[PDB]
Write a protein that holds these residues in place. Sequence first.
Motif, short mmCIF file in Angstrom:
data_model
loop_
_atom_site.label_atom_id
_atom_site.label_comp_id
_atom_site.label_asym_id
_atom_site.label_seq_id
_atom_site.Cartn_x
_atom_site.Cartn_y
_atom_site.Cartn_z
N UNK A 250 0.55 -1.28 -0.44
CA UNK A 250 -0.33 0.51 -0.25
C UNK A 250 0.99 1.01 0.21
N UNK A 251 1.83 1.29 0.34
CA UNK A 251 3.22 2.63 -0.29
C UNK A 251 4.67 1.89 -0.34
N UNK A 252 4.94 2.54 -0.93
CA UNK A 252 6.72 2.39 -1.41
C UNK A 252 7.82 1.68 -0.27
N UNK A 259 -3.39 2.21 3.48
CA UNK A 259 -4.40 2.26 2.42
C UNK A 259 -4.61 0.21 1.96
N UNK A 260 -4.83 -0.35 2.50
CA UNK A 260 -4.84 -1.65 3.07
C UNK A 260 -5.94 -1.82 3.30
N UNK A 421 -11.59 0.14 14.60
CA UNK A 421 -9.97 -0.57 15.33
C UNK A 421 -9.41 -0.93 14.91
N UNK A 422 -9.49 -1.58 13.46
CA UNK A 422 -8.51 -2.02 12.13
C UNK A 422 -7.91 -0.98 11.54
N UNK A 423 -8.95 -0.22 10.98
CA UNK A 423 -7.79 0.91 10.40
C UNK A 423 -7.10 1.65 11.50
#
Lengths: 686, 194
Positions: A250-252, A259-260, A421-423
């Motif tokens: 989800x990122x570099x 972003x997942x 809570x997951x986020x």
Amino acid sequence: QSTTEKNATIFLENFNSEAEDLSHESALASWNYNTNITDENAQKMNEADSKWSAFYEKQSKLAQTYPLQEIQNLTIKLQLQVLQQNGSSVLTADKSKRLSTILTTMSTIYSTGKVCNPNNPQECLTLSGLEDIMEKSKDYNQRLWVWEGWRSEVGKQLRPLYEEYVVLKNEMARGNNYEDYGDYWRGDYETEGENGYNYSRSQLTEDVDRIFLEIKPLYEHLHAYVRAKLMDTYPSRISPTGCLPAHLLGDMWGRFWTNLYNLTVPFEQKPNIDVTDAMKEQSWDAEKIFKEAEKFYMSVGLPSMTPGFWNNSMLTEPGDGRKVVCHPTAWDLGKNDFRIKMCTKVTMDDFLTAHHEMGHIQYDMAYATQPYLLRNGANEGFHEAVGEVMSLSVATPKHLKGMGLLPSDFSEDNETEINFLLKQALNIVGTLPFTYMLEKWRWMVFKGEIPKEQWMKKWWEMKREIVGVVEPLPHDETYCDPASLFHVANDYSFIRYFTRTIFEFQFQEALCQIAKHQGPLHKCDISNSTEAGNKLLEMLKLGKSKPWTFALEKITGTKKMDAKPLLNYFEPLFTWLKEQNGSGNYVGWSSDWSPYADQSIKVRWNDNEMYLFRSSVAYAMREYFLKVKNQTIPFRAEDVWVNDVKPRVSFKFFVTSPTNMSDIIPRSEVEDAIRMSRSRINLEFL
Amino acid sequence: ECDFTSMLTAVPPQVYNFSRLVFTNCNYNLTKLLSLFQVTEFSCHQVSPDALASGCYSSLTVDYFAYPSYLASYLHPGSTGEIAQYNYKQDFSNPTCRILATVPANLTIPKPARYMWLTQCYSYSAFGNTPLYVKPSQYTPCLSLASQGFDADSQTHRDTVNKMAATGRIAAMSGNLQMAFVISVQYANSVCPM
Ligand SMILES: *[C@@H]1O[C@H](CO)[C@@H](O[C@@H]2O[C@H](CO)[C@@H](O)[C@H](O)[C@H]2NC(C)=O)[C@H](O)[C@H]1NC(C)=O
Ligand SMILES: *[C@@H]1O[C@H](CO)[C@@H](O[C@@H]2O[C@H](CO)[C@@H](O)[C@H](O)[C@H]2NC(C)=O)[C@H](O)[C@H]1NC(C)=O
Ligand SMILES: *[C@@H]1O[C@H](CO)[C@@H](O[C@@H]2O[C@H](CO)[C@@H](O)[C@H](O)[C@H]2NC(C)=O)[C@H](O)[C@H]1NC(C)=O
Ligand SMILES: *[C@@H]1O[C@H](CO)[C@@H](O[C@@H]2O[C@H](CO)[C@@H](O)[C@H](O)[C@H]2NC(C)=O)[C@H](O)[C@H]1NC(C)=O
Ligand SMILES: *[C@@H]1O[C@H](CO)[C@@H](O)[C@H](O)[C@H]1NC(C)=O
Ligand SMILES: *[C@@H]1O[C@H](CO)[C@@H](O)[C@H](O)[C@H]1NC(C)=O
Ligand SMILES: *[C@@H]1O[C@H](CO)[C@@H](O)[C@H](O)[C@H]1NC(C)=O
Ligand SMILES: *[C@@H]1O[C@H](CO)[C@@H](O)[C@H](O)[C@H]1NC(C)=O
Ligand SMILES: *[C@@H]1O[C@H](CO)[C@@H](O)[C@H](O)[C@H]1NC(C)=O
Ligand SMILES: *[C@@H]1O[C@H](CO)[C@@H](O)[C@H](O)[C@H]1NC(C)=O
Ligand SMILES: *[C@@H]1O[C@H](CO)[C@@H](O)[C@H](O)[C@H]1NC(C)=O
């Protein structure tokens, strides 16, 4: 009261008087430039910085005449320690000048890095446009040429520059009586004390090692739930027992997993609390956003803003033609002058950012009566931690309901709490193994526990076993994959992001006990509790005049870093994850699998033999696809990847397509092509 | 027959250097004293606007100074801002009324150059600063330092002997002059209206 101490007291009282004036002039010039970017304003800023630097260097040479062993007062002793630091002046004039040239080259290479498509040379991208791909794309092959491109162009330039950086920084650290440059960085946490308040630099490696093993059971269950979701997006690209490919996070860099969320959301039907449309239906401007933050801090017993805060801040993006770079910052100019620079939209994210920035202002206003040099947070993690604690409380549905931004009949269901809570864990728990491994690596490089012949070998061994992440292609010692990150190429310490998280949940748990909250921590709101804001304010006033272990005990009642408060906050999610993974998901990872391991051929002698071997293989492929497949494919020595090299000559290799690095040529076809050209190639093949 | 002329024939002082009129043995007309200006606030405290002129008092006191109207909120003594901290703390031991007014262009009150007030006042040492807070109905201990005035924002005057420092802020004198009156009475037939 020795003559030395009496003399040092007169010295420190003249310095404090003169530093208030010069610091304010230097900070006023810096603010005028950052809110109004012009060439005329860029010279006024540099003139004021030169005046400060001239004064400070002259005062540091005067400070060296007061030995610290003769000072019995701790406030006097802490001020003199700051002024007596030599820094880079311990190196010769040539060596000091070389180290500043290397630092400017490395940050310039990073910021002008540009990658582009192996299948479309005319479209090339900078870091801003490459990060949009890594944060949105669900295409395996697209994410791979962006991931490998950033490492291949940017990372391969900084490798020679980083080897010289390490040698020069170790010479400087030894000239200031440290073991190495990692010992120098760990001195940000070192303190002296009488009754258990002392803290050594070796204690920080032990504490960070122990906290990491306590959060690992929770990180393993989140890793297992995310891995099983990623197996539906990318079929046949992920092993159910192995590590996660590094280009799919989800990122570099895989720093954050946020972003997942669209792929892993526990209950997609139930949406998440967003109040942006309620602020627009009531016609909120950006002023009212900051008037609500001030009411929050006054409700727990903290002061208001000064009159000059409202007249002097930049709370909206200007429309008079001024050029600015929008990034929220809080400014402490001195002389009772506090400003916030922010470009505020009427959204929920800007509403939470305003509370975070105003928290930094509240800390600065609290230690403004300390001596000039002690006007700081207790350590490098306390400042950001305080800001985060305040944002936790104001993002709660309980707080938003009391503001009228949520319907008066709003009810909360337990499926929306699991979504919440997951986020939170994709940010807070996902990045903790990432931060720990990078500091562990840098510290071992500065010690010499890793020689420079094994830099990339150890980097990917640690990724596989601490983080559970595997590289999609093998990288040899011509790469420097750590240096492709901003903080490593720009010479920034990185363990502050580990400690801040630990302190934020220790602070939070203490204040919710004082506020008398019943129920889970994640639902706690400290608003309207003056006893909680008074307990916070006794730590904030101290600044840097006490050991940070003493300021920690003031608010939490304990002297030690502790990860149990973090595990209490994420306890409703830990219970749900064990039911999800419990045929469910295997928990843990194997450091054996890789995206390229099943197609390798093991070959059972310097580097010129490799370049010749890869061309022999490349020629053999190119002829086989013409005499059997009737195709003209221009295989090169760059399409042959050597991995798993032993001191005794035994390595493995595989071939990829010249335009598509996702396409690995099957082990069956590679074997046949070697048999056809076995005569010209000549070497046991296993 | 209480006189308000000395309030009208000279330039008004700043908030940290307020002037005080105490009237004893005279008869007042508060309606005549205010009709001259443009009252834009009359917040009172254990008294009311209509009862302010009605009563008979043991004594009457008037404090007055130049004051920008956009700083009206900070003039309440229960504020944690700089005005109540260093410049003027209003005494809630007696009935008090707070009047903010504007001086019309017809009134020939001499204007000052600008508005001035203190943002800091403290004693300094190698061990940090100690803020000096003004007492109710009294004067700041930084008055001797502040007397010289301030021409810029965040300008500091230091007293190297007593080791005190004061910091000031300024505001441009735009348009008509604006002032503030704080009226406190005590309880008794000496001071009466007509
Ligand atoms: C933004 O910066 C410009 C450049 O300094 C400012 O323009 C100058 O303002 C000063 C007043 O202090 C004048 O003496 C100069 O002649 C101006 N130069 C130019 C090129 O305009 C401008 O005032 C700043 N804008 C704001 C809103 O502060
Ligand atoms: C600081 O900001 C305030 C805004 O609250 C400004 O107050 C305005 O002043 C003008 C002229 O005095 C009045 O016409 C407006 O009505 C005031 N606004 C409000 C909301 O009362 C004040 O001028 C600013 N001060 C400086 C020095 O810029
Ligand atoms: C903090 O307490 C204040 C009162 O001391 C709360 O203000 C009231 O809130 C209710 C709804 O929660 C409103 O109906 C009232 O109109 C509010 N009164 C005033 C005077 O504002 C405030 O909501 C509390 N804050 C939180 C976050 O609970
Ligand atoms: C939210 O609470 C409800 C309770 O009403 C949970 O529903 C129960 O879930 C357990 C799962 O172990 C089942 O054994 C029960 O039979 C369920 N009861 C009912 C009445 O449905 C629900 O699972 C909770 N949701 C979450 C995400 O925790
Ligand atoms: C303290 O300062 C005075 C004046 O410069 C000097 O004479 C004296 O020797 C100093 N004492 C010490 C111990 O430095
Ligand atoms: C250090 O100096 C401060 C300020 O004078 C004083 O309060 C404190 O007692 C001193 N401590 C020691 C150990 O001398
Ligand atoms: C800084 O360098 C000077 C110059 O040799 C040295 O005398 C001094 O001891 C150094 N300072 C510290 C704190 O080591
Ligand atoms: C503090 O010092 C004591 C004795 O010198 C030592 O035993 C202890 O480990 C130290 N504490 C820390 C946190 O380093
Ligand atoms: C997640 O979904 C939302 C809503 O469709 C979208 O706006 C957002 O860009 C998505 N984020 C990612 C990383 O795909
Ligand atoms: C008080 O002054 C006002 C102002 O003109 C005047 O109209 C009124 O008659 C006066 N009151 C008395 C009792 O004279
Ligand atoms: C206070 O103001 C008066 C004028 O009203 C002036 O004569 C006096 O000198 C001032 N005192 C100061 C500035 O300390």
